[PDB]
């Protein structure tokens, strides 16, 4: 279905919750069919379409009794048990697959393979099944969440040219003076995951300076350039070679990394930093003047591969990670939407 | 409460103000980590420097609570909240059986199980669940009507 | 607007700004569209331009004929999804033949690799109004990517290559400069135009800075509190000294030219003149980074940190009379190969200038794609025809429902060579039936249209050469956008 | 099935060709009367401001008038380009630009030939038109005697078509002398063009030295004789302060009196540091405070405030001084010196006129006349003159004007068509025919049978008399070297190049798509 | 009546054209010519326009007769060259200091304008002025040095040449009553007499109670010292420039100045300094530590009058060497408009004497030149023959328009006057 919303937001979809949500339902009783869909995406991911389908066709097969002088009370006294009996049928009918000739991973495979069929990526299921099923595995903490396998979107390229990353990724390059002059490719790095802004206090706590004697002047300024020498050389004396931070890295901070052959990035996505540490094995520190080498991270290869004429930071190949990152292509910028919603529909079945 | 201006006179003050601010709050948290605490529930705000140190000290942190929660949480674990940060008393602490991130409906939710209790009425239509909360409350109060008289 | 016989569309912004282009992506990106499918095609071409750079034009043509070839099969009574499926398995057989048949530039020597990259540059250029100097314009796009791309990493950065445009003369006078052009003059009018390297150095040395030639102030809000008059005299005689402590800091470092991020003070400027330090007031952040990489230099935070090793090496620095009456510019050129390379494009008209820049980028993109994928196919329809034939012979082998879809995919492909021979001025059926037939009678798969008009159709000896990835992406994106439209049957549009 | 949004216009092939031609032609035809000696002037007027201007400079027309036809605006810009890169040949570019496009429509319709084939034919011709141009070019060597007389000519040629035709000779030496004077610099800021209303046009002059639109420091001596000048950029009224934030916190009023007197001292000292320079003339870009103004007068130093980055630079070129700041070490900085700075009166306003100067490398031309529009034009006209010349200091080869230059091309192009053959051949001939359509208008505006005279000049030139140009007062073919109607090679080379580009831009046009206006 | 609202009554032609709302661009060109005549002569702004109107009318008939305008334009300018030559040969020179004729010259220019009632005293005292302001090396004369001040009330009669200086402002009188200082020495101040602050951001912070009463102590003192250093140089008149900057002259300083009998005049524009410096033999004073008896004036009397109820400031009698000479003229008039016109009729006459400083020759008037030229340029063209002869003839015919409109304003048979004027000019020559 192709839906163009009231605000020109053009959307193509197969996702039942996504179709029913983009339709503004006003009728109070028909809004139930939007909730009924919504609960299904919330607990399962697939079925959203089928759930609404069933619901109405129960109401429609109750109308031939409602036309005759029957009480709706007794009709639902009959359905309430019918569903309680339908659940009894499935529980007896469900097959524990660990018992009978199944593969360790062809359980999630042949299961995503069903969720794919119907949606756009049907003719590409092969590719997406042996990737997003795989993506639930790297995700596995004892108990897991999809917040850790965050999807990134990049305009252009075939949807086949999508890329599985065993580390993390940034749909986000930034650029300062040195960022081009810096090395944008490592092998075995130590990833320092920082928090606080490396510069001359760009949004920090304001404090007024009163100075009576002139010579205090070059002193107060030479205190500043020394206050961040400590904060910066604090990074060099860590054993790090890749510096990421939730807050900004300045023009004058990037300089020291550029010459000292260290890679740095500022204004990192908040979700991405928590995506990095889980797949780099590091720890987000809010202060440089404390850091032990027990906080750093590693990977197989860090490079800034340019995909779709936007610069992506790809540090990947991390042995033991409780996180990964999908990186998705697709023809138009509306395809990339209906593959992301299509893939969330497979992952949650897996 | 009154505007906090920070008047730096000599250059010796800059290095020692910031590096001392490191310690100032690291010492605020240590006076609560050396009391054998494993969970600090915050009604108000939390500082990024302050969470950093509590992050290392191996302690869970739970922000957001408005007035409603601090009181109803207080009755379950059996703590007593203090506004003065300098008196973490062993006699005014709590005790909780399980504090985990049980994900329900896909939501990252914190639990405080095992006094004040809580029912999690699950369903489909967020519309009908709302009514059966009024059905539950009809009885919950009908129980309060039994006791008093 | 397809091919070297292509024509140019002339689009006007709502404000009034005029553009005259051949870049299919640009064309569609300018027209104020509305019909949701047209809108989508706008993104379809906009997709190509990013993942490749060339092809934007033919990507649409292929999608539309495919949608047309579907249409005829729908009115026949066939289900769209089974057609869309029938197209994709027929797209996977087209790319497969292309891969098995594409020529390769990996098995080449160094003398023959730099030629195949020119041959592609030639190809991509001959189409747009640049064709005039497509010997010179091509010998640019090649020069740029060799100089900037990390060989083993096989990765070219288009942030490194800067597109500079200035209007005057002709397109012939468009040059590639082994350094940087700046819209900046010299900070003091008395300073010289040329700067000559002190003979024994073989370089000029640059004072690339990121602090202003101004008495240092702190970042945190401040104030003095002067009570004693003499202590205002201690301050007064600090202001001039903290200026001389800048000049000497540079003069003692051994630099001959100062390029500084922020601006110089009025007192500092004259003292920059007296001691023979040609200065550059207010230089761009990105532009400093491009200077420091070209000059082999380093970027310097404060005066205290300046040393004779953080200097920028140049072979010349000159302020050019960019116009005859307009404004001066600064060129910092090199005889050696520098990782940054500014591309200075000139024309007789602001519209040519923009199109000329828009041609290089396209031309520069085919050469970037060949560094990534060192394999080529031959255009002029040849690549499309080999795929058309390949899918055509396999349709009879497919059988059942998809027999008609494969026959459709192949048939709609034939619109590219037909609408090539059409614009070029030949019979559609003629060139097609000659070309497709000649590609079976011989084992050769590299026979195409003589769109210029020479005797042979031999795309090999004619140097009409396309990159591999280019051709491939131009199909996958079409078939995949095509499937999406076919999946759609229920359409709900709101109100504006 | 409609594609576009509303208010959107689609002018495709058959209609896009119309627009492209209608536009170009409509614009070409607008300025056609400007061309040549017996050419006429347009009166442009804004809706805005109740302003107008009476002009020849063909750019100045095109730049001004509003237009919608995108193809037109293309040519309009090719006009500015020329005014940028050469300064003259504004109308020569546009007409040749349109005349190519006129000649295309006559091919695209009447004959039915492909636009791209026309292009691949207009191209072969252009490279051949520019070819012979260099072969026929007359480069002037070391003989600066033979080259000045050569320059004076170029101007005389440029000037005849403006109001300055009648006093051609007069204005020709005022340009030639000013540009030579400029000493090979190609920046025109160095010639300050001061137009003061009143008197004759023949009353206009280039001063020997410099005239300054400034005043003397107050009750100061009205005429300095035997000057020595310091040129400065340093603060004065603003009161020099160390930039940061030097707030005064006086414990009790007492100290403020000392601190007020302190700022006065900081001045008395910075004037003393200047007094050490041993100079009677202090000129400053910045303002001289009410205070320093007196401190100079008491010392006897003449002080001139407010002549900006503009005025200061020229003074530095004419007096041979330096744009000095600092003033801490008088030894290393080079002073300026001239003979007399007496204040003159011109109609009403007082100007300080530096006379007898160290180095004449910067100059002032005072333009006069009866009407604010006459001035306007004189300025515009002079800029067209101070251009060709200046750029002929750079590009020092000449070509015979009077239609001759364009004809020698029409020759080579037309003979190149006798070589090429095919459908291209017709387009190559056309190029030459367009080139002919230039002398055509030169004659047309003068008034004799265009058809006869251009056809009288073709023969002579084709026959090998490649001097022959158009005697545009007598209505005859006469010698252009012996009559001295010379032009810049850099001029003509550009006219051909630029035009050949336009056609190859519009001829590729087959679809004009206009958005909904903002 | 102004677009803005103001009422203007005039005879000065440039003043007439500038203030009507001419719309046609070519018609606006006429205003420019009339402006350019004012900026070359100050007189003849009417003559110059009418000539264009009869020259254009000429050009019209020639275009009717089919003559290419380029020829017309150039031969009309060839008509200029020969005509201005004639005026240069026919003119009788003037002794650069000859009152009896220079005075007739102003008397001519006035007699046309609403001030011609009092042209008897207005002509000489406009001539008297320019020669005093002139020079020996003559040159080009600046009329910015002639000071014409307005004040409404009375009659044009009451206009007077002041034997010194007129000033715009008045004695402050806020504190004390100094107004008419006799045997006076004038000081001229650039600086502020306040409790001033340095150009940097400054603020007196107060810690103690005992700091307060001592702050006013120095405050009162600081202002008194300045007023003391003034009385010490020995001047009884103060003149202070524009205080838009910051301070001005304080109300506390003003009582010091009053009881110390120094008469004060505040707010004086920066343009006014150059003139006042020369007009009052008084060197301008920037800082206090540069206020000296040396730079004071020594004028005989300064006394502020009371005219219509509205005061003006007089400086009569000025002792010292007048190396720079300066005049000041007070204009009165019954109605606002008839004051502005008095100034424009002075400036027109003042300007004719200025032109006599420029080209030291003088011609006969009342059309006489315009008729001679007509006669001369006729005989020239009878020799010309061909096309460029008809032009000159039509040109000679045009110049005749001046005497025609002159006569037509007088209600005469302009035809009869002219034919007779040309016949008598054919013999009796350059005076008819
Ligand atoms: N010199 C040539 N001879 C024959 N065919 C050519 C030549 N140059 C380009 N082509 C063909 O014509 C097409 C050029 O289209 P173009 O206008 O460059 O748009 P795009 O390449 O972006 O689709 C290519 O597909 C190519 O195969
Ligand atoms: N006195 C002259 N005699 C003959 N030809 C002239 C004369 N003056 C200029 N020309 C010719 O007329 C043209 C100049 O006309 P103009 O209106 O200035 O156009 P543009 O602004 O394009 O230079 C040149 O082609 C030149 O050859
Ligand atoms: F239509 Be669904 F969310 F599989
Ligand atoms: F017209 Be294209 F994108 F080479
Ligand atoms: F009309 Be021009 F620019 F000589
Ligand atoms: F009417 Be005028 F300018 F004497
Ligand atoms: Mg499903
Ligand atoms: Mg191409
Ligand atoms: Mg010209
Ligand atoms: Mg008069």
Q: Which residue of C has its CA nearest to A334?
A: C40
Residue A306 in contact with partner chain C when CB distance is under 8 A: yes
Q: Which residue of D has its CA nearest to E272?
A: D218
Distance from the A119 Cα atom to the nearest Cα atom in chain C, whole angstroms: 9
Residue D430 sits in a domain of what CATH number? 1.10.560.10
- Do chains A and E touch by CB distance (3+ pairs < 8 Å)? no
Centre a 10 Å sphere on the Cβ of residue A246 and count the other Cβ atoms it contains. 20
Q: How far is CA E395 from the centre of its chain?
A: 35
- Any residues with CB less than 8 A from the CB of D416 and at least 6 apart, and which? D124, D125, D128, D428
Same domain for D90 and D128, yes or no, is yes
Structure tokens at D419: 């070589």
CB contact under 8 A, A303 and C153: yes
- Any residues with CB less than 8 A from the CB of C388 and at least 6 apart, and which? C410, C411, C413, C414, C436
| Cα–Cα nearest to E302, from E188, E407, E411, E416 | E188
Contact D465/D378 with Cβ under 8 angstroms? Answer: no
Structure tokens at C57: 């034009």
Given ligand 1 and candidates C53, C380, C388, which is best to mutate, with the most ligand atoms within 8 Å of its CB?
A: C380
Given ligand 6 and candidates E39, E46, E49, E51, which is best to mutate, with the most ligand atoms within 8 Å of its CB?
A: E46
Distance from the B50 Cα atom to the nearest Cα atom in chain A, whole angstroms: 9
Same domain for D240 and D144, yes or no, is no
Give me the phi and psi of D472, to 5 degrees please: -85, 25
Centre a 10 Å sphere on the Cβ of residue C304 and count the other Cβ atoms it contains. 12
Contact D442/D490 with Cβ under 8 angstroms? Answer: no
SS3 D489: helix
Q: Is E12 a catalytic residue?
A: yes
Centre a 10 Å sphere on the Cβ of residue D172 and count the other Cβ atoms it contains. 23
Query: What are the DSSP E strand ranges found in E29-108?
Result: 92-93
CATH match of A98-165 with 3.30.260.10: yes
- Do chains B and E touch by CB distance (3+ pairs < 8 Å)? no
Contact C297/C151 with Cβ under 8 angstroms? Answer: no
Query: What atom of ligand 3 comes closest to residue A18's alpha carbon?
Result: 3
CB contact under 8 A, D251 and E205: yes
Domain boundary assignment for chain A: 98-165, 169-350
| Cα–Cα nearest to D252, from C232, E210, E211, E213 | E211
- Any residues with CB less than 8 A from the CB of A291 and at least 6 apart, and which? A192, A234, A238, A285
Give me the phi and psi of D178, to 5 degrees please: -65, -40
Q: Determine the distance separating the centroid of ligand 3 and the alpha carbon of C279, expressed in angstroms.
A: 66
Residues of A in contact with C285 (CB under 8 A): 176-177, 251
Distance from the D218 Cα atom to the nearest Cα atom in chain E, whole angstroms: 6
Resolution in A: 3.8
- Any residues with CB less than 8 A from the CB of B94 and at least 6 apart, and which? B39, B77, B78, B79
Domains of chain C: 1-105+375-496 (1.10.560.10), 106-178+339-374 (3.30.260.10), 179-338 (3.50.7.10)
Torsion of CA A122, A128, A133, A138, to 10 degrees: -160
Contact C275/C181 with Cβ under 8 angstroms? Answer: no
Structure tokens at D336: 């300026």
| Experimental approach | X-ray
DSSP A332: S
Q: Determine the distance separating the centroid of ligand 7 and the alpha carbon of A168, expressed in angstroms.
A: 29
Task: Give Rg (Cα) of chain A.
Answer: 27
Centre a 10 Å sphere on the Cβ of residue D135 and count the other Cβ atoms it contains. 9
Residues of D in contact with C266 (CB under 8 A): 233-235, 325
Query: What atom of ligand 1 comes closest to residue C22's alpha carbon?
Result: 17
Q: Determine the distance separating the centroid of ligand 5 and the alpha carbon of D160, expressed in angstroms.
A: 9
Query: What atom of ligand 4 comes closest to residue C55's alpha carbon?
Result: 3
| Cα–Cα nearest to C243, from C220, C218, C275 | C275
Report the C-alpha gap between B97 and B90 in whole angstroms.
Answer: 18
Same domain for D167 and D244, yes or no, is no
- Any residues with CB less than 8 A from the CB of A13 and at least 6 apart, and which? A1, A3, A19, A22, A337, A338, A341
Host domain of residue B42: 1-114
Residue C225 in contact with partner chain A when CB distance is under 8 A: yes
Structure tokens at A46: 């697939």
CB contact under 8 A, B14 and A36: no
Report the C-alpha gap between B7 and E245 in whole angstroms.
Answer: 34
Angle at C247 between CA C245 and CA C248, to 5 degrees: 70
Take atom 1 of ligand 6 and give the residue whose Cα is closest. Answer: E12
- Any residues with CB less than 8 A from the CB of D149 and at least 6 apart, and which? none
Same domain for D367 and D288, yes or no, is no
Report the C-alpha gap between E170 and E162 in whole angstroms.
Answer: 17
Report the C-alpha gap between E89 and A56 in whole angstroms.
Answer: 116
CB contact under 8 A, C224 and A211: yes
Q: Determine the distance separating the centroid of ligand 10 and the alpha carbon of E109, expressed in angstroms.
A: 5
CB contact under 8 A, E142 and D345: yes
Beta-strand relationship, B39-41 and B60-62: parallel
Residue listed under structure tokens 């990947």? A316
Same domain for D369 and D293, yes or no, is no
Q: Is E316 a catalytic residue?
A: no
- For chain D, how many structural domains are there in total? 3
Query: What atom of ligand 5 comes closest to residue D31's alpha carbon?
Result: 1
- Any residues with CB less than 8 A from the CB of A226 and at least 6 apart, and which? B15
- State which residues have CB under 5 angstroms from ligand 10, the bound ion: E 43, 109
* D404-420 vs D115-135: helix crossing angle, rounded to 10: 130
| Cα–Cα nearest to D101, from D125, D72, D63 | D72
Distance from the C157 Cα atom to the nearest Cα atom in chain A, whole angstroms: 8
Contact E128/E161 with Cβ under 8 angstroms? Answer: yes
CA distances from D496 to C445, D96, E127, E162 (A): 45, 8, 65, 72
Q: Is E348 a catalytic residue?
A: yes
Same domain for D316 and D338, yes or no, is yes
- Do chains B and A touch by CB distance (3+ pairs < 8 Å)? yes
Ligand 1 pocket residue status of C126, Cβ below 6 Å = yes
CA distances from C424 to C3, C474, D238, D320 (A): 8, 21, 71, 65
- The secondary structure element, H or E, covering residue A168 is strand A168-170
Angle at C146 between CA C141 and CA C148, to 5 degrees: 95
Q: Closest to E214 (Cβ–Cβ): which among D252, D350, D373?
A: D252
Residues of D in contact with C15 (CB under 8 A): 518
Structure tokens at C349: 């008209």
Given ligand 2 and candidates D401, D453, D483, which is best to mutate, with the most ligand atoms within 8 Å of its CB?
A: D401
Same domain for D388 and D462, yes or no, is no
Residues 133..192 of A with a Cβ closer than 8 Å to C: which? Answer: 155-161, 175-181, 185
CA distances from E322 to A186, D54, D289, D297, E146 (A): 88, 49, 27, 18, 15
Report the C-alpha gap between A150 and A278 in whole angstroms.
Answer: 12
CB contact under 8 A, D218 and E284: yes
The secondary structure of chain C, three-state, reads CCCCCCCEEEEECCCCCEEEECCHHHHHHHCCECCHHHHHHHHHHHHHHHHCCCCHHHHHHHHHHHHHHHHHHHCCCCCHHHHHHHHHHHHHHHHHHHHHHCEECCCCCHHHHHHHHHHHHHHHHECECCHHHCCCCHHHHHHHHHHHCECCCCECCCCCCEEEECCCCCCCCCEEECCEEECCCCCCCCCCCEECCCHHHCCCCEEEECCCCCCCCCCCCEEECCCCHHHHHHHHHHHCHHHHHHHHHHHCCCCCEEEECCCCCHHHHHHHHHCCCCEECCCCHHHHHHHHHHCCCCCECCHHHCCCCCCCCCCCEEEECCCCCCCCEEEECCCCCCCCCEEEECCCCHHHHHHHHHHHHHHHHHHHHHHHCCEEEECCCHHHHHHHHHHHHHHHHHCHHHHHHHHHHHHHHCHHHHHHHHHHCCCHHHHHHHHHHHHHHCCCCCECCCCCCCCCCEHHHHCCEEEHHHHHHHHHHHHHHHHHHHHCCCEEECCC
Report the C-alpha gap between A56 and C394 in whole angstroms.
Answer: 46
Residue B16 sits in a domain of what CATH number? 3.50.7.10
Residues in chain A: 350
CB contact under 8 A, B18 and A227: yes
Centre a 10 Å sphere on the Cβ of residue D440 and count the other Cβ atoms it contains. 21
Ligand 1 pocket residue status of C467, Cβ below 6 Å = no
Contact A280/A191 with Cβ under 8 angstroms? Answer: yes
Report the C-alpha gap between A310 and A152 in whole angstroms.
Answer: 12
Tell me the H-state helices in chain B. 11-33, 48-56, 67-73, 128-147
Return the sign of the alpha-carbon dihedral for residues C331, C335, C340, C345. positive
Distance from the C40 Cα atom to the nearest Cα atom in chain A, whole angstroms: 7
Structure tokens at A314: 């790809």
Q: B interface mutation test: which of A38, A39, A44, A214 has the most B CBs within 10 A?
A: A39
Contact D132/D466 with Cβ under 8 angstroms? Answer: no
- From the candidates C21, C26, C56, C338, give the one annotated as an active-site residue: C56
Structure tokens at D408: 């020698």
Angle at E346 between CA E341 and CA E350, to 5 degrees: 150
| Cα–Cα nearest to A193, from A253, A165, A147, A235 | A235
Torsion of CA E147, E148, E154, E157, to 10 degrees: 80
Strand ordering across the sheet containing A10-12: A10-12, A2-4, C491-493
Overall fold of domain A169-350: GroEL (3.50.7)
CA atoms within 13 A on the CB side of C225: 13
CB contact under 8 A, C476 and A158: yes
Q: B interface mutation test: which of A25, A35, A347 has the most B CBs within 10 A?
A: A35
Report the C-alpha gap between E73 and D163 in whole angstroms.
Answer: 10
- Any residues with CB less than 8 A from the CB of E344 and at least 6 apart, and which? E10, E12, E15, E113
Residue listed under structure tokens 């992050």? B55
Host domain of residue D104: 1-139+396-518
Residues of D in contact with E142 (CB under 8 A): 345, 350
Burial of C266 (0-12, 13-18, 19+ CB in 10 A): middle
Q: Closest to E278 (Cβ–Cβ): which among D166, D199, D219?
A: D219
Residues 181..210 of A with a Cβ closer than 8 Å to B: which? Answer: 195-196, 205-210
Residues in chain C: 496
Contact D259/D248 with Cβ under 8 angstroms? Answer: yes
Q: Determine the distance separating the centroid of ligand 1 and the alpha carbon of C383, expressed in angstroms.
A: 12
CA atoms within 13 A on the CB side of E151: 20
């Amino acid at each position: 279905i192709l839906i163009v919303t009231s605000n020109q937001k053009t959307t193509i979809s197969n996702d039942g919750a996504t179709i029913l949500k983009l339709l503004d339902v006003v009728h109070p009783a028909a809004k139930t069919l939007v909730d009924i869909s919504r609960a299904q995406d919330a607990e399962v991911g697939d079925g959203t379409t089928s759930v609404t389908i069933l619901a109405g066709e129960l109401m429609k097969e109750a109308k031939p009794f409602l036309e005759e002088g029957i009480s709706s009370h007794l009709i639902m006294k009959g359905y309430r048990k019918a569903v309680s009996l339908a659940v009894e049928k499935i529980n007896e009918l469900a097959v524990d697959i660990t018992s009978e000739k199944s593969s360790g991973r062809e359980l999630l495979e042949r299961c995503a393979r069903t969720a794919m069929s119907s949606k756009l990526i049907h003719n590409n299921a092969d590719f997406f099944v042996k990737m997003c099923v795989d993506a639930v595995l790297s995700l596995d903490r004892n108990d897991l969440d999809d917040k850790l396998i965050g999807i990134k979107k990049i305009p252009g390229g075939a949807m086949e040219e999508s890329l599985f990353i065993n580390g993390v990724a940034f749909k986000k390059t930034f650029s300062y003076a040195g960022f081009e002059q810096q090395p944008k490719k490592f092998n075995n790095p130590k990833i320092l995951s920082l928090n606080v802004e490396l510069e001359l206090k760009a949004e920090k706590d304001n404090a007024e300076v009163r100075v009576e004697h002139v010579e205090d002047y070059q002193a107060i300024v030479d205190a500043e350039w020394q206050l961040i020498f400590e904060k910066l050389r604090q990074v060099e004396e860590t054993g790090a070679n890749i510096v990421l931070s939730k807050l900004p890295i300045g023009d004058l901070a990037t300089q020291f990394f550029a010459d000292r052959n260290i890679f740095c990035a500022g204004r990192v996505s908040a979700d991405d930093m928590n995506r990095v540490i889980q797949a780099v094995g590091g720890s987000i520190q809010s202060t440089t003047s404390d850091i032990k080498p027990e906080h750093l991270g590693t990977c197989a290869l860090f490079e800034e591969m340019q995909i779709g004429s936007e610069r992506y930071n790809l540090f990947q190949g991390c042995p033991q990670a409780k996180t990964c990152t999908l990186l998705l292509r697709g023809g138009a910028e509306q395809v990339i939407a209906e593959v992301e919603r299509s893939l969330h529909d497979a992952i949650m079945i897996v | 409460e009154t505007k906090g201006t920070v008047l730096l006179h000599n250059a010796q003050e800059m290095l020692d103000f910031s590096k001392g601010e490191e310690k100032q709050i690291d010492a605020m948290m240590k006076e609560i980590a050396d009391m054998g605490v494993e969970c600090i529930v915050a009604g108000a705000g939390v500082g990024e420097l302050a969470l950093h140190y509590l992050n290392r000290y191996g302690i869970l942190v739970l922000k957001v609570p408005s007035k409603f929660e601090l009181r109803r949480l207080c009755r379950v674990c059996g703590a007593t909240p203090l506004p003065r940060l300098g008196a973490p008393t062993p006699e005014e602490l709590g005790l909780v059986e399980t504090v985990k991130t049980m994900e329900i409906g896909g939501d990252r939710v914190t639990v405080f199980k095992q006094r004040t209790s809580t029912i999690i009425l699950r369903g489909a239509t967020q519309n009908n669940l709302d009514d059966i909360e009024r059905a539950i409350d009809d009885g919950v109060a009908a129980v309060k009507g039994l006791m008093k008289p | 607007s397809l091919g070297p016989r292509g024509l140019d569309k002339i689009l006007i912004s709502p404000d009034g700004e005029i553009t005259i282009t051949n870049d299919g992506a640009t064309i569609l990106s300018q027209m104020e569209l509305d019909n949701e499918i047209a809108k989508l095609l706008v993104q379809l071409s906009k997709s190509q331009d990013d993942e490749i750079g060339d092809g934007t034009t033919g990507v649409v043509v292929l999608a539309s004929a495919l949608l047309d070839q579907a249409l005829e099969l729908i009115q026949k009574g066939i289900h769209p999804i089974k057609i869309a499926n029938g197209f994709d398995e027929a797209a996977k057989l087209a790319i497969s033949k292309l891969e098995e048949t594409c020529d390769d530039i990996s098995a080449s020597n160094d003398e023959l690799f730099r030629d195949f990259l020119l041959r592609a540059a030639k190809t991509s250029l001959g189409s747009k109004i640049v064709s005039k100097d497509h010997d010179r314009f091509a010998e640019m796009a090649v020069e740029a990517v060799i100089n900037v791309m990390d060989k083993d990493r096989k990765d070219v950065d288009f942030d490194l290559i800067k597109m500079q445009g200035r209007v005057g003369g002709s397109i012939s006078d468009s040059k590639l400069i082994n350094g940087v052009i700046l819209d900046k003059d010299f900070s003091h009018p008395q300073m010289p135009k040329c700067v000559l390297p002190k003979e024994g150095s073989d370089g000029v040395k640059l004072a690339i800075l990121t602090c202003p030639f101004e008495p240092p102030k702190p970042k945190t809000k401040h104030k003095l509190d002067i009570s004693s008059v003499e202590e205002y005299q201690k301050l007064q005689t600090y202001e001039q000294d903290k200026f001389k402590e800048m000049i000497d800091d540079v003069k003692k470092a051994g630099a001959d030219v100062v390029i500084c991020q922020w601006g110089f003070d009025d007192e500092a400027n004259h003292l920059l003149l007296q001691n023979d330090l040609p200065a550059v007031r207010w230089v761009g952040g990105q532009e400093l980074e491009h200077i420091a990489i070209s000059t082999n230099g380093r970027i310097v935070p404060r005066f205290q940190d300046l040393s004779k090793d953080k200097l920028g090496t140049c072979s010349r620095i000159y302020e050019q009379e960019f116009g005859t009456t307009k404004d001066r510019m600064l060129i910092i050129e090199q005889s050696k190969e520098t990782k940054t390379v500014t591309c200075f494009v000139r024309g007789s008209n602001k519209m040519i200038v923009d199109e000329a820049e828009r041609a290089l980028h396209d031309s520069l993109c085919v050469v970037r794609n060949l560094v990534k994928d060192s394999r080529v196919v031959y255009g002029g329809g040849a690549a499309e025809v080999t795929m058309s034939l390949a899918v055509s012979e396999e349709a009879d082998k497919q059988r059942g429902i998809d027999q008609y879809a494969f026959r459709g995919f192949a048939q709609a492909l034939d619109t590219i060579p037909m609408t090539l021979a059409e614009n070029s001025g030949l019979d559609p059926i003629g060139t097609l039936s000659t070309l497709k037939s000649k590609q079976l009678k011989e084992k050769i798969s590299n026979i195409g249209v003589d769109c210029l008009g020479y005797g042979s159709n031999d795309m090999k000896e004619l140097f009409v050469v396309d990159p591999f990835i280019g051709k491939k992406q131009q199909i996958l994106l079409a078939t995949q956008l095509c499937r999406m439209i076919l999946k759609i049957d229920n359409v709900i549009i709101s109100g504006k | 099935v409609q594609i576009f949004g509303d208010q959107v216009t689609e002018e495709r092939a058959e209609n896009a060709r119309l627009s492209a031609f209608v536009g170009a032609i409509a614009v070409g035809d607008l300025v056609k009367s400007t061309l040549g000696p017996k050419g006429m002037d347009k009166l442009l007027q804004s809706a805005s401001s109740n302003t107008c201007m009476v002009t020849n400079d063909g750019a100045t027309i095109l730049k001004s008038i509003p237009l919608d036809n995108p193809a037109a605006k293309v040519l309009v810009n090719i006009s500015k380009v020329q005014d940028d890169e050469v300064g003259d040949g504004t109308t020569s570019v546009t007409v040749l630009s349109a005349e190519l496009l006129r000649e295309a429509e006559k091919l695209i319709d009447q004959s039915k030939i492909h636009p791209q084939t026309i292009i691949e034919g207009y191209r072969l011709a252009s490279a051949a038109a520019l070819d012979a141009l260099t072969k026929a070019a007359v480069d002037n060597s070391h003989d600066k005697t033979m080259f000045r007389e050569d320059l004076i000519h170029i101007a005389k040629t440029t000037l005849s078509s403006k109001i300055l035709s009648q006093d051609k000779d007069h204005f020709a030496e005022l340009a030639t002398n000013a540009i030579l004077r400029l000493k090979g610099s190609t920046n025109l800021e160095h010639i300050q063009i001061i137009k003061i209303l009143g008197g004759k046009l023949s009353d206009s002059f280039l001063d020997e030295g410099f005239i300054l639109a400034k005043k003397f420091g107050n009750n100061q001596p009205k005429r300095i004789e035997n000057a020595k000048i310091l040129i400065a950029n340093t603060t004065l009224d603003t009161d020099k302060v160390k930039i940061f934030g030097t707030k005064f916190k006086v414990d009790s009023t007492a100290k403020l009196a000392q601190l007020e007197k302190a700022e006065r001292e900081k001045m008395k000292n910075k004037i003393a540091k200047i007094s050490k320079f041993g100079i009677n003339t202090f000129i400053n870009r910045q303002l001289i405070y009410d205070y320093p103004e007196q401190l100079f007068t008491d010392l006897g130093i003449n002080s001139i405030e407010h002549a900006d980055f503009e005025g200061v630079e020229r003074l530095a070129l004419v007096t041979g001084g330096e744009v000095v700041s600092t003033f801490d070490e008088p030894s290393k900085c080079k002073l300026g010196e001239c003979d007399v700075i007496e204040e003159i009166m011109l109609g009403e306003q007082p100007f300080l006129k530096f006379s007898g100067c160290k180095a004449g490398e910067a100059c002032t031309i005072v333009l006069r006349g009866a009407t604010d529009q006459t001035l306007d034009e004189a300025e515009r006209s002079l800029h067209d003159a101070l251009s060709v010349l200046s750029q002929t200091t750079k590009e020092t080869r000449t070509v015979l004007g009077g239609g001759c230059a364009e004809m020698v091309m029409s020759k080579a192009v037309d003979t190149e068509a006798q070589n090429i053959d095919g459908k291209k051949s017709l387009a190559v001939e056309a190029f030459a025919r367009a080139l002919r359509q230039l002398p055509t208008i030169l004659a047309d505006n003068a008034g004799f049978d265009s058809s006869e005279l251009v056809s009288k000049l073709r023969s002579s030139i084709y026959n090998g008399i490649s001097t022959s140009g158009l005697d545009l007062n007598n209505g005859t073919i006469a010698d252009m070297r012996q009559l001295g109607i010379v032009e810049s090679y850099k001029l003509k080379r550009a006219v051909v190049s630029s035009a050949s580009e336009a056609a190859e831009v519009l001829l590729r046009v087959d679809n004009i798509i206009r958005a909904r206006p903002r | 009546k102004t677009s803005r609202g103001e009422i203007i009554i005039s005879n000065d032609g440039h003043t007439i054209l500038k203030q009507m709302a001419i719309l046609h661009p070519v018609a606006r060109m006429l205003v420019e010519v009339s402006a350019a005549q004012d900026s070359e002569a100050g007189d003849g702004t009417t003559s110059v326009v009418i000539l264009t109107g009869a020259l254009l009318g000429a050009a019209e008939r020639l275009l009717n007769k089919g003559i290419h305008p380029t020829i017309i334009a150039d031969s009309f300018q060839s008509a200029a060259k020969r005509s201005v030559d004639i005026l240069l040969e026919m003119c009788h020179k003037v002794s650069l200091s000859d009152r009896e004729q220079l005075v007739r010259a102003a008397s001519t220019s006035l007699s046309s304008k609403i001030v011609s009632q009092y042209s008897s005293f207005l002509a000489p005292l406009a001539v008297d002025s320019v020669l005093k302001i002139s020079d020996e090396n003559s040159k080009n004369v600046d009329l910015n040095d002639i000071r014409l001040v307005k004040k409404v009330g009375g009659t044009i009669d009451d206009t007077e040449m002041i034997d010194g200086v007129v000033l715009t402002q008045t004695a402050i009188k806020s504190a004390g009553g100094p107004t008419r200082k006799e045997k006076a020495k004038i000081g001229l101040i650039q600086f502020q007499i306040s409790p001033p602050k340095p150009d940097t951001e400054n603020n007196i912070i107060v810690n103690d109670y005992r700091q307060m009463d001592k702050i006013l102590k120095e405050e009162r003192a600081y202002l008194l010292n300045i007023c003391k250093k003034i009385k010490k140089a020995k001047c009884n008149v103060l003149l202070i420039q524009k205080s838009i900057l910051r301070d001005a002259v304080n109300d506390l300083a003003l009582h010091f100045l009053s009881k110390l009998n120094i008469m004060v005049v505040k707010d004086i524009e920066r343009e006014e300094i150059e003139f006042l410096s020369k007009g009052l033999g008084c060197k301008p004073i920037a800082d206090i530590e540069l206020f000296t008896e040396d730079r004071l004036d020594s004028a005989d009397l300064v006394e502020e009058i009371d005219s219509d109820g509205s005061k003006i400031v007089r400086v009569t009698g000025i002792r010292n060497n007048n190396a720079r000479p300066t005049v000041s003229v007070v204009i009165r008039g019954a109605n606002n408009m008839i004051i502005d016109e008095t100034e424009r009729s002075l400036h027109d006459a003042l300007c004719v004497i200025r032109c006599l400083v420029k080209e030291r020759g003088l011609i006969a008037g009342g059309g006489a030149p315009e008729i001679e030229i007509s006669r001369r340029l006729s005989k020239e063209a009878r020799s010309m023959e061909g096309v460029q002869a008809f032009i000159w003839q039509e040109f000679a015919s045009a110049l005749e328009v001046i005497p025609t409109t002159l006569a037509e304003n007088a209600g005469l048979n302009s035809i009869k006057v002219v034919t007779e004027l040309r016949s008598k000019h054919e013999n009796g020559e350059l005076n008819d």
